[PDB]
Amino acid sequence: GYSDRVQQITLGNSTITTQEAANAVVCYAEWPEYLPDVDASDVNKTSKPDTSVCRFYTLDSKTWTTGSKGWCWKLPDALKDMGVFGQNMFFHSLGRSGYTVHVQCNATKFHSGCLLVVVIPEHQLASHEGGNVSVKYTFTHPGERGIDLSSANEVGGPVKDVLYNMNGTLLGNLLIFPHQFINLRTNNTATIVIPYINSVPIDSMTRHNNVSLMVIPIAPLTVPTGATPSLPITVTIAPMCTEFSGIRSKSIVPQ
Amino acid sequence: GYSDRVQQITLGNSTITTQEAANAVVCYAEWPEYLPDVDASDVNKTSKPDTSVCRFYTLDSKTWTTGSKGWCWKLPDALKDMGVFGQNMFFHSLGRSGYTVHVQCNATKFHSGCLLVVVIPEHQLASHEGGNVSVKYTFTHPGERGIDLSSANEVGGPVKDVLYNMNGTLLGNLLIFPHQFINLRTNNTATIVIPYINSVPIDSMTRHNNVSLMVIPIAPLTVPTGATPSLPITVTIAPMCTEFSGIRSKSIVPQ
Amino acid sequence: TVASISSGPKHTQKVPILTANETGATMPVLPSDSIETRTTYMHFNGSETDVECFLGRAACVHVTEIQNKDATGIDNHREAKLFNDWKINLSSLVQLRKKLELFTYVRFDSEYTILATASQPDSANYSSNLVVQAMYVPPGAPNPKEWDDYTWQSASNPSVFFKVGDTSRFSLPYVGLASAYNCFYDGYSHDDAETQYGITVLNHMGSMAFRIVNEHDEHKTLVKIRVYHRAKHVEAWIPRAPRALPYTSIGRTNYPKNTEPVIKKRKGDIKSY
Amino acid sequence: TVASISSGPKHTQKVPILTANETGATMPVLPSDSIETRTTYMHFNGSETDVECFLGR
Amino acid sequence: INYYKDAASTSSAGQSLSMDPSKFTEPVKDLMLKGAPALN
Amino acid sequence: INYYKDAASTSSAGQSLSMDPSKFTEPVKDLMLKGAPALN
Amino acid sequence: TKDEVNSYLIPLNANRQNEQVFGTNLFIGDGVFKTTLLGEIVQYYTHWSGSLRFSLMYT
Amino acid sequence: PDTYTSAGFLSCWYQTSLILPPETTGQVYLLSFISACPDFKLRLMKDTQTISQTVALTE
């Protein structure tokens, strides 16, 4: 009586149940694991807070309306302030982590709409100015708020044009990245497990984000007659196999 | 060529060397160890940050002068703000820890003076008011500053009379507690290893301090002629075998 | 190898063509799941689509130019194109760039070919024979200031001398600092509020300085340098969506404003053929 | 080859970090004598620092 | 025959002949069998 | 393959792979053990 | 202001408490490090990795 | 020196304080050394900014 459909994920002191899942994706078919010695470089023993950092943090909720263009969060940024995960983050020189991402959106059998939930490794954004204008730090570190693709261009911020993925590629091809759809008629959640993907064994958690999670409405939300025209979307994310190394004074970052 | 005299303690990412030690005391002849299952009650898996919390924090320095009466720090309070030790502390419901305490005071072969360095398990202080006046919270949670026994009585604070240990017992008998002397002529540091001592397996780190460390001048400081009449005393302390459990929202404590 | 097996009529309870794309999978459906097929063999291996093959041919990565002329009274050799440097890149001419950015991290050895041809746009009695010197200048080395500085001694820095009209060829190991070169980097060099975004040393491949060794003849001679780059021993990770809009800058993802629709509009209906 | 071995807390009478430089020696002290380390391998031979290589171009 | 000492100096590599699209086409956590229902 | 008769004409030598810093880092007459006191 | 034997000497003051003796960044190819043998050799190469040993002898 | 690639800082402070014996006075100095651990790797040789010249030397 197991269905692909019902699932339970327990991680730390927190549990999620979905009764309307559509399997789960594990990026590149690899599950998060700690850093092996053969791959290690820094000689420091690392710190593995385990259950105090590897639990589920639910970010603040978004509201899908007929005019929504899509939202974008960066990792580990989105979690920069969650509990002890965040403290560890500002206090060590280097850290490394994988995540379980669970995006939630329920409706009824009269609604229609379909969101794309995708994880993009190394999502370098484009400046809407063109040329070689850079995208300032603050703009690519929105924190739990994430970036709202239907917000206005700002100065020093990225471009927010959806048919171009914020980088000069077409929305249609985002499907080459680990992703899952939430089609109100099928699905009510999306779950993706992200292994740590980098060109170095461990890195800085503040100067470099290693994935952007993106939720994009593709088939517009259509509510039943005289229904309220909107649904909330909630994102809950859990660091998994986290390791921190090179402890010290506590980083100070712009803004 | 090993002497009782020279020592090195490396704990985490921090190391201490003393070239003029007088052995080291291990309270009640027991070395800190984690909490065994047979002794466990709370069902929660605990978090053991290891090297990020088990390193040496050096508190701010004191100044021994001919008029000094002695100083008193409480644990884990004194460390409530040190790095990730402190964060963990405010963020979990329960925690447990042992410590290595290293008290430092060097002079020259012309100085004289002798400090008592003692650890008192469950040091319940007395109100200087008498009767059944209580000692308010803030007063018994001085933080890294500790309590200065030569400061004035304050209201809601403890009594600071040294011949009575702040509790109705005589200074002379403090020697029944694990302790070590720093006699300028012999010694320049004192080191005590404290195992976790409580009547419960794990407790709250904020509502209850489980040891007071006390440094008390007993033979007054006497400097050579026309020397400056004072010496600094420094206290460095390292949590060891720390475990935190029952993570959540982050305690808010008076003042 | 069979490309298709033989398959006949089906009337089952087992439907391989109905799936749920919401899952993120592309189910491996074949012609034989939905029509009746006959056996056929592949006759093919997919040899020429190997990434080593795809990135393994020489591509022009840079065209520069230097001239041989009397430096007498020139206050700025660099500025007179008496000599010229180039900080190696693979993202300035777009053909090879789009190919590499199909991947996120890439690791390979480089084989460089350098073709140099001379031009004599104004009245010369003859064509002189010039020798070019190409010096590889790693970050931290003294940089040439004049076309005949002590720098050109290049006692510790690899340099090649070849003749204009000829070609020079040598191969450099993978010089990246990390395990792969980042084709993309969503980071900064530090948490500065104004530091540059995206451009990184993670990509840095050295830099190269060119000059003519010859002193000047009576006429002037323009020498134009073309650097070709061939990846050998290629390793590529994490495929990405291909580049759709035009490029504007080395190292940023930025596209031009008021660009044109990249999807061709139908001449007719959705229903049109 | 290991570049660093794993090493944990120390509370000894044996202090490798105190020396007397007046002797003229450079005592071979390592990260693992004064912090807690994890194993890591060298992955490197020192090929390009051979004097034949240094004077050989 | 390599005429040169260093590995970078050798010619192009030879075909992976590796080929396994499943990390890209089927990264699902619970295995899907073609023919069985997608969602049970 | 050497094509030439004289030894000077051969290519570069090959890595010492000798490496022993102790003549430079520890030329002391009585051996010093790390961890033991420097001066006894 | 001119090279002197004195720039090898880090001074110490009697009776100061809590205060700072010296500070430097660790760009081994520049600044204080640059003229040392280590600094001087590092400069013949482009990349370095590894641990450094910094010792202080008291006089 | 490069940012992305930067290595940190090194500082030194009084832990307690220097104390001179009687009949003694003034500043005392520390000598400081640097050498590389056996850990160390250097690669990709290049030319040093530490030496240059304007005309060839002669005897």
UniProtKB/Swiss-Prot annotation, chains A, B:
Q: Where in the cell is it found?
A: Virion; Host cytoplasm
Q: Tell me the domain of life.
A: Viruses
Report quaternary structure and partners.
Answer: Interacts with capsid protein VP1 and capsid protein VP3 in the mature capsid.
The protein's job, in short, is:
Forms an icosahedral capsid of pseudo T=3 symmetry with capsid proteins VP2 and VP3. The capsid is 300 Angstroms in diameter, composed of 60 copies of each capsid protein and enclosing the viral positive strand RNA genome.
Q: What is this protein called?
A: Capsid protein VP2
From Swiss-Prot, chain G:
Organism, per UniProt?
A: Human rhinovirus 14 (HRV-14)
Q: What is the lineage of its organism?
A: Viruses, Riboviria, Orthornavirae, Pisuviricota, Pisoniviricetes
Interval of the full protein contained in this chain: 391 to 449 of 2179
Please give the subunit comment from the record. Answer: Interacts with capsid protein VP0 and capsid protein VP1 to form heterotrimeric protomers. Five protomers subsequently associate to form pentamers which serve as building blocks for the capsid. Interacts with capsid protein VP4 in the mature capsid. Interacts with protein 2C; this interaction may be important for virion morphogenesis.
Q: Where in the cell is it found?
A: Virion; Host cytoplasm
Q: Any idea what job this protein has? A: Forms an icosahedral capsid of pseudo T=3 symmetry with capsid proteins VP2 and VP3. The capsid is 300 Angstroms in diameter, composed of 60 copies of each capsid protein and enclosing the viral positive strand RNA genome.
Q: Which domain of life is it from?
A: Viruses
Q: What is this protein called?
A: Capsid protein VP3
